[PDB]
Design a protein around this nucleic acid. Structure first.
Ligand SMILES: [Mg+2]
Ligand code: NA
Ligand code: NA
Ligand code: NA
Length: 325
DNA sequence: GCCG
DNA sequence: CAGTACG
DNA sequence: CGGCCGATACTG
């Protein structure tokens, strides 16, 4: 990043607008930031800023005030509720709506939430692991976690393919959580395995809490939970597992590898080509309404590998490490 | 907020 | 359904 | 004007 001095200040607003619920304004700032940190050199002039995709007149203004005042006047008028909204929104399971409600109810600290707020089952787990859920783990630990899941899975079916995705696959030094994709080459042995996999991981005491896990449904697609490796000095870590049919392997891997912003940009590109891209598949000639929403099926394109998805979109392939946005 |  | 979440 | 990712996946 050659514009850290700028991106660090815009980050404050982006986050402020986000916790307040102004999602689209927040996105604007976030995409402007993803652009500056991705710039091949430091910005210097107002015009030079406007030439950058993702930065408009207003944003360019703010960029000059920073390079031209070392500061930004807007950061001094942010509501006093923001810090608290961010404190609350950082509880897993609580978003802008819940944070704003708690604030309106007079709550101002986690002690207030703990003693007076009504919490959903997920939020109670989020609060209990508040600090741990904000920490990142060394990638070496992510490996240990992936291996624990892989071994348990292959224990009852040696053919199961398990791959750590997310920031881990993108080669980052640390990871926020561990994303494990599980599928099977025969395109069938993946069905109804969550029940066995989870209880196995539970038997060894690996899983400590469950956030999202529809186990009554044999069609369960994901498990979002908490785990902890054995031994001293271990922290509770977020574990996200998805089981997918082999025919959707490439799209699921591309999805689960991210980054999130990379996925969104790629999906937006596919749409401009009359296609649709998701973790399930890439389709061409889909039917959309007057608002751009898909309301009719197109034709699912053959995508045995990630490269195929890039190729079909007229895009040069990009290693996972280069999808870090 | 940005962009068409 | 609205809310929150995953990348 | 109006989309900004996903006809995305759970929860209650
Ligand atoms: Mg991750
Ligand atoms: Na621009
Ligand atoms: Na949250
Ligand atoms: Na459940």
């Amino acid at each position: 990043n050659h514009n850290l001095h700028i991106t660090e200040k815009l980050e404050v607003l982006a986050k402020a607008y986000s916790v307040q619920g102004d999602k689209w304004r927040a996105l604007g700032y976030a995409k402007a930031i993803n652009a500056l940190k991705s710039f091949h050199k430091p910005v210097t002039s107002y015009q030079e800023a406007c030439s950058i995709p993702g930065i408009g007149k207003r944003m360019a203004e703010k960029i000059i005030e920073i390079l031209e005042s070392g500061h930004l006047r807007k950061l001094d008028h942010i509501s006093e509720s923001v810090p608290v909204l961010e404190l609350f929104s950082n509880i897993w399971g609580a978003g802008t709506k819940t944070a704003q409600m708690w604030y309106q109810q007079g709550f101002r600290s986690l002690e207030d939430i703990r003693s007076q707020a009504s919490l959903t089952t997920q939020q109670a787990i989020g609060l209990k692991h508040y600090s741990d859920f904000l920490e990142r783990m060394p990638r070496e630990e992510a490996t240990e976690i992936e291996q624990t899941v892989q071994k348990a899975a292959q224990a009852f079916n040696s053919g199961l393919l398990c791959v750590a995705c997310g920031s881990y696959r993108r080669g980052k030094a640390t990871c926020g959580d561990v994303d494990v994709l599980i599928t099977h080459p025969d395109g069938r042995s993946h069905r109804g395995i969550f029940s066995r996999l989870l209880d196995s991981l539970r038997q060894e005491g690996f899983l400590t809490d469950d956030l999202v896990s529809q186990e009554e449904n044999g069609q369960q697609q994901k498990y979002l939970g908490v785990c902890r490796l054995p031994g001293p000095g271990r922290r509770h870590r977020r574990l996200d597992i998805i089981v997918v049919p082999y025919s959707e392997f490439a799209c699921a891997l591309l999805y689960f590898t991210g980054s999130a912003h990379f996925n969104r940009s790629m999906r937006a590109l596919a749409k401009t080509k009359g296609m649709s891209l998701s973790e399930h598949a890439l389709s061409t000639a889909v039917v959309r309404n007057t608002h751009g929403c898909k309301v009719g099926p197109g034709r699912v394109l053959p995508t045995p590998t990630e490269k195929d998805v890039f190729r079909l979109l007229g895009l040069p392939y990009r290693e996972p490490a280069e999808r870090d946005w």
